[PDB]
From Swiss-Prot, chains A, B, C, D, E, F:
Family the entry assigns: Belongs to the protease inhibitor I13 (potato type I serine protease inhibitor) family.
Keyword Coiled coil: no
Source organism: Hordeum vulgare (Barley)
Highest classification ranks of the organism: Eukaryota, Viridiplantae, Streptophyta, Embryophyta, Tracheophyta
One MF annotation (Gene Ontology) recorded for this entry: serine-type endopeptidase inhibitor activity
Site (Reactive bond): 41-42
Keyword Cell membrane in record: no
Disulphides: none
Official protein name in the record: Subtilisin-chymotrypsin inhibitor-2A
Amino acid sequence: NLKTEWPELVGKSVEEAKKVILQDKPEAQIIVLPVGTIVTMEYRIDRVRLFVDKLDNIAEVPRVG
Amino acid sequence: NLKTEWPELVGKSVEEAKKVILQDKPEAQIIVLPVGTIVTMEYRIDRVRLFVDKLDNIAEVPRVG
Amino acid sequence: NLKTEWPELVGKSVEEAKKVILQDKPEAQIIVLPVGTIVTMEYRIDRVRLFVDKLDNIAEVPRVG
Amino acid sequence: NLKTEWPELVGKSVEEAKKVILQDKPEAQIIVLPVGTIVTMEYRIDRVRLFVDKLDNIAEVPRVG
Amino acid sequence: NLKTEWPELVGKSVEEAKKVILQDKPEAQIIVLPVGTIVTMEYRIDRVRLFVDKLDNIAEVPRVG
Amino acid sequence: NLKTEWPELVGKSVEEAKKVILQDKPEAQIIVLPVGTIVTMEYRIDRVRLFVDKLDNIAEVPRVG
């Protein structure tokens, strides 16, 4: 199996979002970036990037990679 | 039906704007970004992005997506 | 008629500039952005964008749109 | 005549630089922007843009326009 | 030999990451930049760039250069 | 002669770096910019730009120009 996306998280705080992701993916390495950030094309299975808005709310669906 | 745009909101504060949108779209997930931000081409029906100016006023017509 | 540009405003503070614009265009929706900001190609007659410098002075001629 | 460039100003503070420019161009409208800022292609004879570094020192030769 | 990449570091703090790198590469010159930063194409053997997220966690695999 | 590059400076503080450069080039006009900054293609012999990281350390080899 595998849970790789957290659509239910758009709009929630980073605090709330961490808590859920860690529940579902105990080994996740959570990265917090501002929306519009260009990342390196490297794929990492244990990583979860959160793309946040000005108030630190999840602005896009979190996904593994 | 559907209310998907809030033209009447250009120039108003984020506080004022939240209040109106939530009135019209109780399930809206409000995202606040600075004008000029490049977003991901993903369409979400419950989402409302607010594009704000330096003083946090709505700079463009808010819309669903 | 119509007053759509405030060339006399380059260099003045946002506070001073607001005051003048509102005098001439009582219905103006004043938006304050940093110089170099890319805006959405939408035209709004009641809107006045102020493009400011590091000290919040008007850096370019204010115009309707 | 006309004094349109202040090469002698690279490295000096904005405070120092203002003082000199105003000496030479009493009608100058001084604009302070960070180096790397893209401006609008509009030419203004009374305007002097200062392009500053992280410490607010003049990083490039000030010029009219 | 040579240790040139620290994959085990994604997600860790800059403080933690410094400590490990210096352990493995005592002569490393540690540089801390935000993710999405465009660097100069110059290669330096003693240098280790850390690409950090909003909370200062390592967002990409640290490497020499 | 001429000393135009300070390779020995990568990783050092701006404070430390100033001190060295001024030692070697007493007439240097020191400019401090963040890495990734696009500068104007103008060449100045008395100028030394320092490209700094998030902690204000020299991230690239300082050079005249």
